[PDB]
Amino acid sequence: YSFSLTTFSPSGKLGQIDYALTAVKQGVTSLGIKATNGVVIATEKKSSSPLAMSETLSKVSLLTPDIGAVYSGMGPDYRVLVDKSRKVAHTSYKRIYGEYPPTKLLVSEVAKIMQEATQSGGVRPFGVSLLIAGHDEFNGFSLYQVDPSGSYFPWKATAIGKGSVAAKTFLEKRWNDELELEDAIHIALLTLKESVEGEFNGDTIELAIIGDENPDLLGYTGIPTDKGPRFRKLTSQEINDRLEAL
Amino acid sequence: HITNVLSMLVSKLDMNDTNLTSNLINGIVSIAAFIPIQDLTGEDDYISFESDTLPLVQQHFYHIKCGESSKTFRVDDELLNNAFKASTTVFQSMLKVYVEKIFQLVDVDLEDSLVTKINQTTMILQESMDDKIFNYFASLLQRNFWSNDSFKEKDPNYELVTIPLAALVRRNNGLSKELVRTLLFHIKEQIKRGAGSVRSTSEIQQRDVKLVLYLTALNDVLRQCHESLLEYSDELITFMKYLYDNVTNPPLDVITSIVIHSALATLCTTEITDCRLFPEDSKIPEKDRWGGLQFDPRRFDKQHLSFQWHVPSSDEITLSISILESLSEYCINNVEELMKAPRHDSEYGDMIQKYVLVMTHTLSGSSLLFDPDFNKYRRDLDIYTCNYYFGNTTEEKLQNPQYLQVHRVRARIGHFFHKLYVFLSTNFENNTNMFQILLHGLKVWFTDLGQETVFNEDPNAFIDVDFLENVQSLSHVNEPFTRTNFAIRANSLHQSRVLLHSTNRKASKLENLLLVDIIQLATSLYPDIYKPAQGTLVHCMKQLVGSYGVVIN
Amino acid sequence: TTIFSPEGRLYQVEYALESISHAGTAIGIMASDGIVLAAERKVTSTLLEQDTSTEKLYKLNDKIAVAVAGLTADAEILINTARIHAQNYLKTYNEDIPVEILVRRLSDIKQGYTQHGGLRPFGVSFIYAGYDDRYGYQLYTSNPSGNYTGWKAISVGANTSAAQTLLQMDYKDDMKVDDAIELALKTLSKTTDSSALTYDRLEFATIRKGANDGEVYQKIFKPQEIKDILVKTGITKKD
Amino acid sequence: MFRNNYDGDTVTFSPTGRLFQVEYALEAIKQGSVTVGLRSNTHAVLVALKRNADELSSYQKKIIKCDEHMGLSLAGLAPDARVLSNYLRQQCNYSSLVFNRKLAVERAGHLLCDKAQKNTQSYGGRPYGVGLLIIGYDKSGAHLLEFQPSGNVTELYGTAIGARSQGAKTYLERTLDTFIKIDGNPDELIKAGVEAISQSLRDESLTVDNLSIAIVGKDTPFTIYDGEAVAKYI
Amino acid sequence: IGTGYDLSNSVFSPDGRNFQVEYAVKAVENGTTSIGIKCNDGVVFAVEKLITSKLLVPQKNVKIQVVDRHIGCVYSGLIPDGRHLVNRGREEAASFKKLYKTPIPIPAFADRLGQYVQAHTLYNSVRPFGVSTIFGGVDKNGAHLYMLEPSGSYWGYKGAATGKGRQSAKAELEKLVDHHPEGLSAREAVKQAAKIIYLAHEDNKEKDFELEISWCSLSETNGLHKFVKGDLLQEAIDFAQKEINGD
Amino acid sequence: AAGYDRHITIFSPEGRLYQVEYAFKATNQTNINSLAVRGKDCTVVISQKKVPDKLLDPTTVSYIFCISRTIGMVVNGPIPDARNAALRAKAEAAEFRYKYGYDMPCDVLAKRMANLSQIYTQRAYMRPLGVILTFVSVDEELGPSIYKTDPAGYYVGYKATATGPKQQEITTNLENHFKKSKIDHINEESWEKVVEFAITHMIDALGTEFSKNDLEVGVATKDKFFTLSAENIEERLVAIAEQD
Amino acid sequence: MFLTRSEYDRGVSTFSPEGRLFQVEYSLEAIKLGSTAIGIATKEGVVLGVEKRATSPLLESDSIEKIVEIDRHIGCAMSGLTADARSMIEHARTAAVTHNLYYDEDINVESLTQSVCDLALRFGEEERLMSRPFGVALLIAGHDADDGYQLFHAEPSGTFYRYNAKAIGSGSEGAQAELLNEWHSSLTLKEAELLVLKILKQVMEEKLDENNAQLSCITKQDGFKIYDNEKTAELIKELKEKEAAE
């Protein structure tokens, strides 16, 4: 009944999704790097006021104990996708296989949610691009980007938002196939130091890793079988100590 | 009927319907362009709008709406002239509502075309006022400006109030001293309250909006101060230093550096002061002048069209050179003290950008003092005689020591951009925004010789010749125009000669060194450096003979 | 909005067909003893993960493969539906799905997204491949309209016309799978927009029989195996 | 030359607070043949002129029965007058089954208002194109309701609806005390309506087939007259 | 270049306002003049009822509606919209009484009545109610008088006026609340209500009218809402007449 | 007018949902300024009360709402949209306390309310409410707290958030106090000094003195959020007047 | 010619300033464009007849029968045949049989006519209202114990009249004028047959014969029957000698 949105423009383009990539292109930059023994995802926190407490606005998010996410675009669209992404990991895979899904199966499911918003009446496509990063026993370490289209891509490194073309040029110039996780952290902190809109310190910067297992963070002992979280979100003191090594 | 319609149009201006507001503004500027905004009443103590005009308007409208032709309507010429004279007493309350509507439009999400049209109508109104009505409107446009509630949103239409203030200062040089003094006091207060002390990039913060208002008002007012600037020149220079010392937010540096452009520009620019519909409060046309002489033979009269011009004084050029060499030395010396001990800090880059930005806006504005042929000295028939200050002959130019002093500074700023390019490419070769600022500095340095090419097309406090030609042109009728349109046509003529003056030249080794750096940056691996640098390269090839050979080599 | 043009033609299908006409080239060739699929992949990104396990070429079950021209986001919805149908047929009949039943299954879903005005059509063209006992080695194509056709050799996506002409003059009904390897690589090197073909720009696969009478085997080639058929064929971007 | 932007949808308001589609729904009443409603203290009456499209064509139905104690006439849209009258009969039966009364005609008015106002407030429909005169008798005496399709109603001693009804309306208004007293002699309340409706016939005449009469008061329930039943009333 | 913002209901204009709710109050501005006066122990409602033909049946065409039993309701503008909002109010109070076994607070009936009207400003599938309501009563906290808009806005008042005569009525209500700061009695409010209504009818002097009045006083009517008639009505009509014939 | 882009929640070529930007202008339709601050063991909300008509009852004008025992909010925007959002927030706290067996945190209610605003910010047939919601409590996990939520569905924590058409002056004076004092709360051990401090800032920012009936106050301690009456406000105005 | 367009034309579910629904009104004008159909009611039978357009010889007649049986006592003439005409007729068939098996007696023709008009008010198969038209004009003819021989013009509006005689299709004006000038309550069945043939002759342009004209009648004794070509021929011969006898 003349009802759909995101119909085809005569040059073979989807139109509304193109406008949804202009909303993504306006966000505070986020980026991700894959190393030999770990991965890094990073972004800046932009305050609406200096009275705001940005310990409340997390931008880097745990999806499963071995998978992290970050966005550029509309943060509200990203709070709603992250909670569906968490529900998906448990309901589709953990509750059937007693183990969490890989970072290719969860990226497919997030992308399936964003594709369904393009092919609908009544709904606009998402205003976010998501970087999803993680580890699995047989695939190893991985990084993926997901766009408003529901297209997903495996990346060695990437960036999204305002500073993304200069970030992606720095990531091409600096990436090599023998990086380690302390190296990738330094490259990511260097890349955000160019893209930063505000002040640069451990309070304005979000940074997470999927690295080795951390048996401290499992919060209970007695089960070696359970190795403990690969995903760790850098503390504001560690970020300031690494920002003293810069 | 017309002044009744004018106040009905002004009171109907709307903040929701941007299309109705556009069609009301077409009517208001069309009324304004043909009518003198003047009280014609002869000290006839019996006259009133409510007691002569509005009764006759109701009788004529009622006759016409009954079904009768206006040819049947009879009235005495006595009542008709009293009702016309009474119609002219209503203008000061119309302007009170007009300023009040203008301050409500500052917060609306308007299109650039309608903001420009609103500036055109506000300025055409001002040029149509006698000194009585205008003095009331000028004291009305400054009282509302200080006492507003009207700059609340994320991105205000500052132009809708600040271009009108600059047009007040174009008509009356005497207003500038108290307006500028009061602005810079309100700027100093906002910097003390902490405006511009929290970093952001690509957005003005809502804590900064009043500081941006007073700075953009200062930029616009300064661009129209002309010779009234001589009085408070020392104060403005010592305030400019303070403004560069105390605010370091990147989005505010572009605004605070444009203050020097606007200050320098007024001193050395040649332009029309007077666009008035009728001049001086003192010319021979009788008060029977309600249509703007448009269909008369004496519209063309030299005594009607005795325009008055800003032609630069020797005192204003000596101030211009003095501001230029003072603010450029200041920025050179400040960046050179940061070239010792670089830091990768976000502050260190934003400080470097500020002084470099300031050194680009000292080259703008003083741009009218430079001269493409200086490098030939160490015939030539220019048909277009753009008004220069040092003279049209080579002989005149080099026999003034201020011509050499101006060229010395151009060269010394250009040599600093090369000394900066080696610093940034050696220490900071990833840092895109200070390369974009350097490339804008190099673009201005290559292009703006003896003419102004940036700040040429952006909205300003002169009336638009295409807008007033669209209002007053009529097919198969010859020059159906008023004095305002003849004035801006004479301004457009001199402006054309300045922009038709050829800048093509042969290099002096400094242009080659800097062109080779533009070619290097055009070949750079970052999109945000190479795309600007390729655009700069296109412009710098236009400036130099044989430049394509040097690029392909 | 799924309304006819006054000629009795569907604007949305034509615009989806304009979209796939940009979407990278894929060739399939049916030898006397196996099927070859090959696809050309525009790797303009250095940091995109080549040696990812799939992009253009996919398994639908143990004897069926596809190549994709079009949106990969759209293709993966159809690919999963086809995988579910293949296993639901195997569960019902205890037998592997016939290729015609599955190719036309995805052609019936893609027609529905062209009739109802709430749905945009799918911007995807599939060159299916497989074996079954009912026919043998079969090569099919399907496009955004829901049309499908049987072929001995076919191209889809960009540069279809040049590729069809090159196939037509070199194809023989009695050729072997190694001749179809050679032909599909030659055709793509004689059709490519990129200066020369190389193992990361190329996705490859085969549907051979092997040595053992009950086998049919679908090697979707890893990059190192593609480098070997490249250096054997004389495309040979070799030290 | 004078386009109205605000009359496309039933849900739009004019800048002056008008619902133009609803005011156009009233102009559909002026498309019907005249019907006249009037009441005394003990009887209410309807008299209706019925049209045809050709001399071979059976005359249009104008009076409809909802229950023994009330019914209606319809000068507006006939197929849309079947929607309201169905719903009113459904409500009469609902009252006898679910509450064991019979639906007092003031309560019938409130239910028609509710139904018509719903059409007037929601997208994806139209206002009702019909005005109803409802007549009834109950524990509170003889009653006459003019339903207008904007979703409104009023208690009235008499009124006329249809084309050229200002004539009949002005005769009832000049002859009101005449019909309000009549009571136990119902045939003069019928002749009062027949004079009133005769003022809307511009040298058209009443005929045995052109006219229908209905009456409902006290014991005598709601009844309709046609053919020679209306010949003694010509 | 166009103004399509006023054609539909779920839409903000550029200034951020629902123009259909701004046009729905224009339907109220055409309405019957009506007032409510709040006393020291009750609420009085008064309305000028225009009689456009003699046929209008007497004392059966009524502008005052009794919502529940301890509350009164007078509305102005589109009459069908007030009927719909009057029937929903009756349902609301009947539900609270069956469930909580006590009469609904007037502040609580007002909130439930103000959430139903705001819900019709949300969706383009419906239009706003083109009616304003005055309603009020006596509960366990005494006397409450509320006025509610097409927008869903509502506040409590000392006296409230709506419809065509609202200007002249509001100016007289201000005189009352200024002369009687502590408040006026039940009998002083009915007399003064008649004066206010007759003074508002001076806008429409040719369109003859009836006055309809109702009580809700803790002392005069035991806290129930009730009609004002007979001698107390005639004593109010004579006060209105002797002060408007002010010779 | 650009067709549907300006009239439904869908992206402009630029990527702007005109339904959300316009709903942020609706919040300033009240002409009311409100202020909120954290003390040591309390959080306080002060709001400008406008009652121009003599005929209003000031006891029925209130932009402060009790959301549960421990949590409360001020609303900036039209009262019909402030009462709708208050009624949701009351229901969301009640169902959380049932499901999870403990009292709904302020952080969780601000997130839950912000997730609801993201619906109207994506569904074309749903419009964003014309209100800003300013939740305050003394959470056992985060002590005194302030959380603000807006028509776009973006919510964040705060220590002194404020909403109004003159909010920039109040915020700029708050930022200068927190810059000099360097503690992230005002160090008073009793809520009376916090409210008095919050009425000293709104006088100094808005350029006007306040009567006891021209001011509003909120007092969030542990175990109670409550609203002050005009005489409790006048005790604080009297103590301000006793100090200066 | 001069243009005469209004702004209310083309309105769907909308009233003009007079109340005019222009979709249902423009649908009622199609009773001049069809092939001619005529009905004549009498005390002896309802005579229905339609002009045939001459077919390709390959099109077999049962494809285009514009006189149809609904039931043994009811039949339709159509001026034009559409899928919606067969939809109305097969709804009428299904309605007539469902009535006979629920109520144990034959359907009243008024009630069948109302049931096909209720289908038109529904627009096939929310409040059923008369806003848009459905299908085509039917002449429904039939006989029942209570209201005798009846001819109904059922219109696209979901409304109808009973007529004594009605013409539809391209003879409407000249036919209805001659019908109203000529019809009697004294018409015998024979005279109703000669009358419908005299009317048909005058509209058809062609020489009237048993290959360009079709007749039928509903009689209570014989039921509905379409007439044999030999029977229309001997009737047409009888018309020739009746005018030659002048």
Swiss-Prot record, chain A:
InterPro entries listed in its UniProt record: Ntn_hydrolases_N, Proteasome_alpha, Proteasome_alpha-type, Proteasome_asu_N, Proteasome_sua/b
Key words of the record: Cytoplasm, Isopeptide bond, Nucleus, Proteasome, Ubl conjugation
Cross-referenced Pfam families: Proteasome, Proteasome_A_N
GO biological process: proteasomal ubiquitin-independent protein catabolic process; proteasome-mediated ubiquitin-dependent protein catabolic process
Keyword Protein transport set for record: no
Gene3D superfamilies per record: Glutamine Phosphoribosylpyrophosphate, subunit 1, domain 1
Main location per the UniProt record: cytoplasm
Highest taxon of the lineage: Eukaryota
Crosslink site: Glycyl lysine isopeptide (Lys-Gly) (interchain with G-Cter in ubiquitin): 104
Location of the protein in the cell: Cytoplasm; Nucleus
Record's GO cellular component terms: nucleus; proteasome complex; proteasome core complex, alpha-subunit complex; proteasome storage granule
Function noted in UniProt: The proteasome degrades poly-ubiquitinated proteins in the cytoplasm and in the nucleus. It is essential for the regulated turnover of proteins and for the removal of misfolded proteins. The proteasome is a multicatalytic proteinase complex that is characterized by its ability to cleave peptides with Arg, Phe, Tyr, Leu, and Glu adjacent to the leaving group at neutral or slightly basic pH. It has an ATP-dependent proteolytic activity.
Family assignment from sequence similarity: Belongs to the peptidase T1A family.
Remarks, miscellaneous: Present with 7060 molecules/cell in log phase SD medium.
Name of the featured protein: Proteasome subunit alpha type-2
Source organism of the structure: Saccharomyces cerevisiae (strain ATCC 204508 / S288c) (Baker's yeast)
From Swiss-Prot, chain B:
CC per GO annotation: cytosol; nucleus; proteasome storage granule
Keyword Plastid: no
GO molecular function annotation: lysine-acetylated histone binding; peptidase activator activity; proteasome binding
GO biological process: DNA damage response; DNA repair; proteasomal ubiquitin-independent protein catabolic process; proteasome assembly; proteasome core complex import into nucleus; proteasome storage granule assembly; regulation of proteasomal protein catabolic process
Record localization: Nucleus; Cytoplasm
Coiled-coil residues: none
The keyword Nucleotide-binding appears for this protein: no
Main location as per UniProt: nucleus
Keyword list, A-Z: Cytoplasm, DNA damage, DNA repair, Nucleus, Phosphoprotein, Repeat
Entry's family note: Belongs to the BLM10 family.
Misc remark: Present with 2600 molecules/cell in log phase SD medium.
Subunit annotation: According to PubMed:12973301, colocalizes with nascent proteasome. According to PubMed:15778719, associates with proteasome core particles and also forms a complex with regulatory particle-core particle (RP-CP).
Domain notes: The bromodomain-like (BRDL) region specifically recognizes and binds acetylated histones.
Record's protein name: Proteasome activator BLM10
UniProt organism field: Saccharomyces cerevisiae (strain ATCC 204508 / S288c)
Residues shown, of full length: 661 to 1319 of 2143
UniProtKB/Swiss-Prot annotation, chain C:
An annotated GO cellular component: proteasome complex
Membrane-spanning segments: none
Glycyl lysine isopeptide (Lys-Gly) (interchain with G-Cter in ubiquitin) crosslink site(s): 91, 190, 222
Subcellular location: Cytoplasm; Nucleus
Keywords, sorted A to Z: Cytoplasm, Isopeptide bond, Nucleus, Proteasome, Ubl conjugation
A Gene Ontology BP annotation from the UniProt entry: proteasome core complex assembly
Function description: The proteasome degrades poly-ubiquitinated proteins in the cytoplasm and in the nucleus. It is essential for the regulated turnover of proteins and for the removal of misfolded proteins. The proteasome is a multicatalytic proteinase complex that is characterized by its ability to cleave peptides with Arg, Phe, Tyr, Leu, and Glu adjacent to the leaving group at neutral or slightly basic pH. It has an ATP-dependent proteolytic activity.
Assembly description: The 26S proteasome consists of a 20S proteasome core and two 19S regulatory subunits. The 20S proteasome core is composed of 28 subunits that are arranged in four stacked rings, resulting in a barrel-shaped structure. The two end rings are each formed by seven alpha subunits, and the two central rings are each formed by seven beta subunits. The catalytic chamber with the active sites is on the inside of the barrel.
Family classification: Belongs to the peptidase T1A family.
Extra remark: Present with 17100 molecules/cell in log phase SD medium.
Entry protein name: Proteasome subunit alpha type-3
Organism taxonomic ancestry: Eukaryota, Fungi, Dikarya, Ascomycota, Saccharomycotina
Protein encoded by which gene: PRE9
UniProtKB/Swiss-Prot annotation, chain E:
Domain of life assignment: Eukaryota
Gene Ontology BP, a term: proteasome-mediated ubiquitin-dependent protein catabolic process
InterPro entries: Ntn_hydrolases_N (IPR029055), Proteasome_alpha (IPR050115), Proteasome_alpha-type (IPR023332), Proteasome_asu_N (IPR000426), Proteasome_sua/b (IPR001353)
Record flagged with keyword Cytoplasm: yes
Any Pfam family: Proteasome_A_N
Location(s), subcellular: Cytoplasm; Nucleus
Family classification: Belongs to the peptidase T1A family.
Other information: Present with 12000 molecules/cell in log phase SD medium.
Name of protein: Probable proteasome subunit alpha type-7
